[PDB]
Structure formats: C-alpha cells, structure tokens
Amino acid sequence: MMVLDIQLFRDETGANIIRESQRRRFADPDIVDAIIEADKKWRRTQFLTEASKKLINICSKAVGAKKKAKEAVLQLKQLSKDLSDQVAGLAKEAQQLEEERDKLMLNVGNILHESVPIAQDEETGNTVVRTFGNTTKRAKLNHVSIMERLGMMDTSKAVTSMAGGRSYVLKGGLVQLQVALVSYSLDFLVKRGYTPFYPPFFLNRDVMGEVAQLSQFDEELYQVSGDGDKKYLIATSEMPIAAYHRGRWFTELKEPLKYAGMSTCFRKEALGIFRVHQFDKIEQFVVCSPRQEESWRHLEDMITTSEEFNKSLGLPYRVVNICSGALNNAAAKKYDLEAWFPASGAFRELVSCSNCTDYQSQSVNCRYGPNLRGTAAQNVKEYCHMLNGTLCAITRTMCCICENYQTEEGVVIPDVLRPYMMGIEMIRFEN
Amino acid sequence: MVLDIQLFRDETGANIIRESQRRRFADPDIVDAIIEADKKWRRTQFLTEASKKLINICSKAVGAKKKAKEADGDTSEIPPQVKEAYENGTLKGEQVEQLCVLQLKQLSKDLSDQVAGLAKEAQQLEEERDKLMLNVGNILHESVPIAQDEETGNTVVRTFGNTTKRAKLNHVSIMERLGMMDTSKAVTSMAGGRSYVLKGGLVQLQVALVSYSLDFLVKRGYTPFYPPFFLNRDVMGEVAQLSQFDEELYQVSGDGDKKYLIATSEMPIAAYHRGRWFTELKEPLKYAGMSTCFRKEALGIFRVHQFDKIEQFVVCSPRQEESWRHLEDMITTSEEFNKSLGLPYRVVNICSGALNNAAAKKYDLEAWFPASGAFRELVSCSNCTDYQSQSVNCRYGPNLRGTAAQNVKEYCHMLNGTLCAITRTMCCICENYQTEEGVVIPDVLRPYMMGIEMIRFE
Ligand code: NA
C-alpha cells in the first residue's frame, strides 16, 4: 500500500497542512484526527514493547548473576516468559493498528501545491497554462479512418478473437512510424541528459504495492502467473523505476538522477489505437534532492521537455494544470499536455507530468541526506523527491500525427522522424 | 504429400508417416492409434448425420399426417428394431414413415438425445485423438540428417568469419564493467529470477538493433508486423504444443478470460492466418514480426524471460517445392544480417531426433563467442510446410461455390525464422567487439545510435 508519510501527522503544524490540503482536494479533513489517534495507540505499543524487551535482558542478566552465585530466580524466569507473552500480544495489536492507520491513509492525498486549481470537475476546472499552434484547425479524416485507409492497422475480429477486446495489429508503414517514434524519443531525452532505462515488465505483488495505488490493482493491472511468485504487468515504466530505488539512500544529489524509461505498458482499462491495453511508452523519471523546492524546478523542465518534443513534431496543443479534485493521491501537482485532434475536433491527453515529492520515495524508503544518529542537526527522516512524466505515448502520438499530417494521398511523415524511418516522406493510402 | 488427417486414412500416406516417425527416432505405433481413434470419431459423425436427416423426415411425416388428419395413433412406443437400426445407422426414411404421429414425435426426441450423446463422444474422441497426435512429427525433408543427438548429429553446412579467435572477457563480465546491466537482487527482488535492467549505451544498442533489423527486412520486401503480446488459451492451443504451456508460457489474467504471453511473434502471426484461404500466392506473404517475447524457461542476459525479437514469417504456396526455396532465402537473410554485423558463425542442419514436431527441416545459425570459446545459437529457421497451417486451417487453392467433399484439401506452407534475438546478439557483439576501453559499436549500427562509435567501461 502506497500512502502519505506518517511523520507530518505527528505535529500540529503538519496536521493542519494536511487538513487544509484535504479540504482543497475536496477530501475528508476529519481523517487526519483518526490517523493521529490510531498512530498514538500504535506508538504506545512500540513504547511498551521496547521497554519490555529491555526488561527481558534484566531478567536474563539477573539469573546469570544469581546462578553464578549459586542461589535458590524462579520468578525472574516466569517474568521473562510473561514479558515475551506481552511483547507477542503487543505485536498483534501493533500490526492491527498499522493496517487500520494505513487503510485510513488511502484517502489522504499528497499536499497540494499552492498553484493547483481548486475544482472538482476536470471538464471545466483545469486551468490552461499555455497553448501552441493552430488549436482550432480542422481536417477531414479522424485517426481511425486514416489508419483504416492506410491498410496498416487491424482491430477487427481476426485480432480481437485472438487477443480480446481493444487488441490490435500494426503493419507496414505504421510499424516504421512506431519504431521511428521510439528511437527519436530515446535520442531526444539522451541529448537532454537522461539515462535510458529498460525495466522488467513484471513486478512482484509486494513491490507493486509500494509504488501503485490500491485502486490500480483493481482497475489497471494484469496478473501474471506460472514462474515462481505471482506478478503484475507494469502499467508504466515509472513503476519499476520507482521500485528500483527501494531501500536506497542518497546522501547528496548535487545532480538529479534522470531516467528515460522505455517499455511496453499494459492496462486492463477497467476507438482505433488511441486507448488500448498494450502500448509503447517513453517516460521521464527524476529523482532529486527534497530541499529548496528543487523538485518544482524539475517539474517545469519536464513539462517544457514534453512541449519541445511536440513542437518538434509540429503537433498543436494546450498544457493544462489539473484541478485539485481530479489529481491522484501521489501527485502534489500535475500538468497534462493535451494535443489538438483536428478531424476529431478535441483536445486529447498525450502527456502528463507529475511532481510526487516524497509520496513514492517514502513508500519505497528512498532516503536522502544524513542520518538521525551522530549529527545533532537531523531530527526528521528525509526522503528523495520523485517526478514522472510521459515523453511519448507512442500510439496516441501516432493517432495525433495521422490527423495533423493527413493529405488526400496518405499521411506525411513529420520532418524530424524521416531519418528514423528510412527517409520516408509519406505513407500512402491503400486505394 | 498434403499432411492432414486425410494422409493417415490413406494406406500409402500412413506408411509415409510411420517412416518419418522412425527417421525421427519417434514412435511409429502412434499412427495406428490416430487411425483407430479417428475411426471411432468418424463413426460418431456418420451416425449424427444419419440421425439429423431422420429427425427432419420425422417432422415432415408428422406435418403430412396432420394435414391429412390421420389419427395420432395408439402408442408412442418405438419398436426395438427401429431403435437398433438408428443406433447402427441403418434406419431408412421409408420405415420411419410407417410409424404413427405419436411414435414419430417420440422418435424425434430419441434421435435428438442420440445426437447430443454422440456430440459428447465426438468431442471426447477428438481430445483422445490429438493427445495421441501430440507425439507425431512433420514429414521430414529428404536432406535432414538422421541422428538422435545434436552435439554430434547436426551437420555443419557453412561457416563465416574467424571462428577460432579468442577474447578476454565474456559477455557477462563486459556488461558488468560497462555499468549498464543490472541483474542483482535490486532487480530480482523486484521482478524475480533472471530479470534484468538495461541502462545507458546498452539500451541505445538494443534500440539500434531493433531499428536496423526492421529496416534490413523492409529492404528485402518483408512487411512489418507488430502483434498483440497476449493470446487466448483457445487460440494459443492451435499454434503451440501442450508442452509449451507447461514449460514455456506465462498465463495472464484480469481483463476477460485467461490469456498467455507470447514466446515468439510466430505465434500471433500464425494465429492471425487462422481460417484464411489464399486462392493463389503468386508472391508469398512475408512478415517481419516485431515483439517482446516472454518465456518461463521451465548468467547475464543470454537466457532471460523477457527479450525483444525480430522474426521472419513466410506464408507461401504448397506447390512446386516453393517453400524449400524460401527456407534457403530465409537462412541466407539471417546470414547476411550477421555478416553485416561482422559476427562469425556456422550454419547447422538440425538432425531428425532434435527437430521439434512442426519442422520438416531446420537450420540454426550459431555465432562464435570468442571469450566463452563456443558456438551459441542466435537464429533458427525452419520450414513447417503445412503443419501449423492445417491446425489453424489456412487453406490454399480455388475457393468456389459448388465444391463437394474435397478429396485433397490444400493448405498454405508456413515458415518461420529468427532475424535477430536482441539480447543474444548484444552478448555476441560485446564479446566480439570488446577492447580495453569498452565495446566498439559495429559500423552498421552506428547511424542507429546517434553515431556512437564505442560504449565505454565505467
Ligand atoms: Na486558430
């Protein structure tokens, strides 16, 4: 279970910050008190447990000194046993309280940035930050009609009877385009200092729970079985990249860690190729210092990077700031880049960029800085900040390119992609 | 020869199969079992057809009697000889027409029960049948070496490059020193045994190989094909053997019914041709399959559960030995691919006992790994003639109105072969292109990874 850091709840100022954030997200602030109470009883079990373990050795040391002195102890033995009984009792309580606490926390979101719009309904509540290109342009055929006329996409029963609903085959020029986008995307981020990262597409349940919200198991994740422990297919490379930092500790990050995640993603989603179960994606993932609001600076760079990508492709768009009621729990702020689809006549999400601050990193225990011990200055456990953002969701981007670059003869290939597909200038309609 | 169940029913055909089994050091007695299970099966179909006709005769006879106002009759009881005759497939319509309405109605019901019992027998005879067919191989090509054991029985056909040079570090050591491959507990505690993370230059190399491989086949007239990575059980059973389910395939669930992850793009490409009928294939269908592959497998990244692969898949005419010509071109394409990368190798003709059931003949290309001191398989190409096509029912020839029970149904031929198994090729390149400073990028890949000439040790 991925939830917010308990430390912030343990003083009045932080509890007030969380209650305010809850109200601004249209969530329950009264939850903060319930979490504080559950935690207070939990801490009490831990206080008694540590004190009783201490007294177990007083019981042992005493027998050790007495039987050394050859003395007729029988109480000290019984007291060791009973204290060990009490510790076992305290552990069962302690475990129940952790589960109740973490359960309550499922409805506590990350602390909202001060710039998040306050609204419940995305339809009207998102705030438009910037726009690019002719976002009122009109065109003849939608992406579905285009890919059909190209003869290069099959979403018919020949496919769906093999692979189930929303499965597809790509062929020909559209596969060339897909691979052009993967390679160009990778190079685009390499040039901006990202390290390529190719993850496993499976994660164990244990680890998936640390990086995924519990509603994602329900609605989004396929389960894979056979070889060893049960696993889940990844819905994004952000999952395995976040999980790769579990139990790490970065004393300093003068430079952030920047990864260009490359994978196939799988989503249960519980037409054409815009919303499908299986898709390639290139993702930006950043791990940085939690200090001086550095993470906020990287969020601006990441959305800017995605914009520059779409500018290079010549795709018109708007960037929106996602309202408080629609943000997922992990995100303190989220930008979506919504491309304009001129045949369809709609803005459609191609990219989202999120600052999750320490939400994931505290769940995976990715620590930062110096330890509580030794140095008198450190009182709080610090954790790295983590951000993630799409660079290119390949099928969605192909759909957008198809509508924007169509002609009577086919789909013109965006200039920058041509050298990544054998110099091809256009893929042509079958007819 | 057209291998389908029809070949088993012909005496000369049954002998061709028995011989092929013996040449494979496999069981020829299976053939008698398939014949016998099939005979029981055909009997259920003969009875079902007879009884279906008699049910329509019953209905028509009741209709004519009702129209004539014939009395319904004294009893519904069916004569024992009538029951014996439909149980034996010898009940004639003219005898059924002697019965009264009450009897005709009872007989209709009884024949309907008979048809339902026969459909369950039919099914259970098909399962008992194919379970016995599980063990029969494709008819061997005449050029297949006859031996049981690969290590001595394969024939080296052809070699390229310096296959005796040695090198210092194996691919595992190289990828460790690059700092670009993680297979430690940080990864395996996340994703299980044999999982890996690739970083930096090795991802760039991986993508360079995918893109170059695709282009290589596009230039040779292959059509790129990006499949779903899932197949329903139903469909997976038509393109895989039962031993692949147990030993090789991950099961996926959540959305809909259970599916299996693909172990090769050959699987969904074959499956995609199910029920098709190509009347003429003047040119063959050539596909460049591009996918991630998943194998349950029941060091480094040579043998891993998850890997990218580019494959060749051909559907062609079953006539004039055309598929034998395509097998030659396919192995030659894989060879030119490895020559273009500067990798030494040998090509081996796989022996009869080591061939999997679908293949009538198989070439493997085993690349020389100079630090490991060994040939390791990078590529297999095989001609499966009509074995998968018969299972997926991909027919060939005229498809016209008015054709009755076709003495010989023809099916397409299918072939498949690796162009590039990406992780295995990367291991091979690392051994063959290592220097003191890192790994030199093969000339042809450089334009596919930003002109990078070398990836350096950490
Ligand atoms: Na406009």
Describe this structure as you would to a colleague:
The structure is a homodimer. Chain A contains 13 helices and 18 strands. Chain A starts with 11 loop residues before the first helix and ends with a strand. Chain A is of the alpha+beta class and 431 residues long. Chains A and B meet through helix 6, strand 3, helix 7, strand 4 and strand 5 of A and helix 9, strand 3, helix 10, strand 4 and strand 5 of B. Strand 3 (169-171) of chain A pairs antiparallel with strand 4 of chain B, so a sheet runs across the interface. The structure holds sodium ion. Sodium ion binds at residues 134-136 of chain A.
Largest sheet of chain A: 8 strands, mixed
Helix content of chain A: 40-55%
Radius of gyration of chain A: 27 Å
CATH topology of the largest domain in chain A: BirA Bifunctional Protein, domain 2
CATH architecture group name of the largest domain in chain A:
2-Layer Sandwich
Q: Give the neighbour order of strands across the main sheet of chain A.
A: 1-11-12-13-16-10-9-4
Number of helices of chain A: 13
Bound molecules: sodium ion
SSE-based structural type of chain A: alpha+beta
Strand content of chain A: 15-25%
Secondary structure: number of strands of chain A:
18
Please report the first level of CATH classification, the CATH class of the largest domain in chain A.
Answer: Alpha Beta
The pair of chains with the biggest contact is: A-B, 58 and 59 residues
How far from one another are the termini of chain A? 53 Å
Form type of chain A: elongated
CATH superfamily of the largest domain in chain A: Bira Bifunctional Protein, Domain 2
- Oligomer state equals homodimer
The domain tally of chain A reads 2
